[PDB]
Amino acid sequence: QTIQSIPQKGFFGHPRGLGVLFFVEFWERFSYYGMRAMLIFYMYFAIHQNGLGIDKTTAMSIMSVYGALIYMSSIPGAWIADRITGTRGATLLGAVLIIIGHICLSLPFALFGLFSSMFFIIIGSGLMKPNISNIVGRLYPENDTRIDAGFVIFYMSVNLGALISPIILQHFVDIRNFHGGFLLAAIGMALGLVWYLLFNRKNLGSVGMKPTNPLSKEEKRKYGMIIGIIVAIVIVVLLVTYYTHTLSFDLISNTVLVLGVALPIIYFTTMLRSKDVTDGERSRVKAFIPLFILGMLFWSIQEQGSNVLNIYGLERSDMQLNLFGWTTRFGEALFQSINPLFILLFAPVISMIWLKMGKKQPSLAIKFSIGTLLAGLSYILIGLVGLGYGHTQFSVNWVILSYVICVIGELCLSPTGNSAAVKLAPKAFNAQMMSVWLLTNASAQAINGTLVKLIKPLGQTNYFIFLGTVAIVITLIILVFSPKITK
Numbered sequence: 001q002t003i004q005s006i007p008q009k010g011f012f013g014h015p016r017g018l019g020v021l022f023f024v025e026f027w028e029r030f031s032y033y034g035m036r037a038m039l040i041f042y043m044y045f046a047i048h049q050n051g052l053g054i055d056k057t058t059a060m061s062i063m064s065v066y067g068a069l070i071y072m073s074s075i076p077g078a079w080i081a082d083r084i085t086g087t088r089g090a091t092l093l094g095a096v097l098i099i100i101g102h103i104c105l106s107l108p109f110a111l112f113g114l115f116s117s118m119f120f121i122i123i124g125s126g127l128m129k130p131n132i133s134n135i136v137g138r139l140y141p142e143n144d145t146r147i148d149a150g151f152v153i154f155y156m157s158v159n160l161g162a163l164i165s166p167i168i169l170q171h172f173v174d175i176r177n178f179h180g181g182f183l184l185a186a187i188g189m190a191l192g193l194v195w196y197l198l199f200n201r202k203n204l205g206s207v208g209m210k211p212t213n214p215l216s217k218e219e220k221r222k223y224g225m226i227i228g229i230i231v232a233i234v235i236v237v238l239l240v241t242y243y244t245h246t247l248s249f250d251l252i253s254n255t256v257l258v259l260g261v262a263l264p265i266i267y268f269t270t271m272l273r274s275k276d277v278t279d280g281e282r283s284r285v286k287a288f289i290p291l292f293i294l295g296m297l298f299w300s301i302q303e304q305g306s307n308v309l310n311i312y313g314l315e316r317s318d319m320q321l322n323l324f325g326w327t328t329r330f331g332e333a334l335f336q337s338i339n340p341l342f343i344l345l346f347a348p349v350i351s352m353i354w355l356k357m358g359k360k361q362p363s364l365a366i367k368f369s370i371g372t373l374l375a376g377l378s379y380i381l382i383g384l385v386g387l388g389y390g391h392t393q394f395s396v397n398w399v400i401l402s403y404v405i406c407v408i409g410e411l412c413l414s415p416t417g418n419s420a421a422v423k424l425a426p427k428a429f430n431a432q433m434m435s436v437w438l439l440t441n442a443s444a445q446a447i448n449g450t451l452v453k454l455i456k457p458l459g460q461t462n463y464f465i466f467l468g469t470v471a472i473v474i475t476l477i478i479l480v481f482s483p484k485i486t487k
């Protein structure tokens with residue numbers, strides 16, 4: 001038994017192991033969301049300002065494509081643990097790769113440093129993210145009611161790291177010491193790796209030491225050829241385009257846009273066409289399709305807060321916080337701390353609003369629509385602000401007010417989507433359903449990479465009013481089918 005080899009207490013009433021992973025995840029998410037806060041500015045800032053001097057649209061496009069690929073990599077990375085290394089092996093190798101990625105940015109390699117960094121982080125975060133989360137769940141026995149609260153505590157390290165890292169790294173942006181800030185994230189991640197290596201054999205026992213579905217002798221040959229050939233085709237395409245001098249980021253953004261739109265269709269077609277899924281379970285897979293649209297329209301506007309909304313506020317607002325007499329210069333990296341702070345403060349509040357009601361609470365469709373409609377209205381607000389003022393430098397309060405409207409929308413969509421990924425899931429397609437919920441983010445981010453190109457032709461202000469209305473009109477159309485969708 002997996003439980004007969006591990007401690008069942010030791011961390012706020014949960015297995016001692018939950019304590020180890022909280023510290024490992026805190027330091028990984030801290031270095032990830034910290035590095036992410038500085039990268040956008042590191043890319044488009046001038047050479048004299050220690051930046052890379054990349055086109056505003058290209059730097060904006062790289063962020064959305066980087067993000068998409070991190071979430072897409074969880075699909076083959078959950079496969080490698082399930083079929084080759086086990087969850088422990090993939091977590092460890094993934095962590096070692098992430099460290100190399102942060103170190104790449106600390107070195108003066110400019111573009112070679114940026115692209116090699118991205119490549120190390122994309123691979124590592126696909127091997128580490130879905131498998132570290134798997135071990136948390138595996139620390140609890142079959143008939144153990146604590147597991148739900150264990151994940152609430154586990155995802156607290158996620159928002160703690162995301163909240164603290166941009167506050168700390170704001171000084172490294174101010175003094176233009178980018179390499180120093182990326183080095184801080186690299187060392188920050190090393191503390192995670194050390195804490196795992198020091199305290200993991202005793203707290204996590206034999207849980208995740210071997211794959212669940214190991215590959216047989218023939219499967220090692222079969223998959224080895226397919227993966228080997230696909231890798232070989234990619235290597236040549238990038239090398240031939242490079243030396244001819246025709247290689248650009250459009251090749252990356254277009255390939256990812258194809259994957260972003262193709263992957264959801266493939267999973268839904270596989271699940272629907274399956275002979276294992278019952279007619280009752282098939283109606284739930286059909287009912288999750290309009291929820292996926294609502295989830296994509298949400299994560300599209302929400303993830304633009306990391307590359308579009310923060311640059312808007314930096315360039316068009318006064319960047320001066322002003323609440324009831326208290327005034328201070330607002331840092332550009334501190335826009336990344338709004339969401340995690342509002343999740344930490346108001347997550348248990350919204351969790352109790354639904355508990356107070358019980359049977360009288362709204363459906364998954366009403367909840368998804370409220371979240372998407374708010375995200376849409378967040379873009380109407382900031383778009384109208386700019387339309388009203390124009391050339392007049394408005395307050396940073398209008399930008400912060402936009403971030404708040406979106407996180408209030410997330411507090412309705414994130415806990416609903418987590419329950420939807422497991423409840424609506426068929427018996428034989430539980431992992432395949434976890435993929436369709438996480439692909440709402442990977443697809444939105446893959447769309448964004450190309451959607452940022454429409455900022456220059458339409459205009460920065462007009463871009464906000466259009467995206468806001470596109471999200472609202474489509475959310476209201478799906479809302480007319482609220483009694484039909486609830487099956």
Ligand SMILES: NCC(=O)CCC(=O)O
Nearest residue numbers: 158159162336337339340
């Ligand atoms: N759980 C992490 C978040 O939702 C915060 C993302 C952000 O920093 O914008």
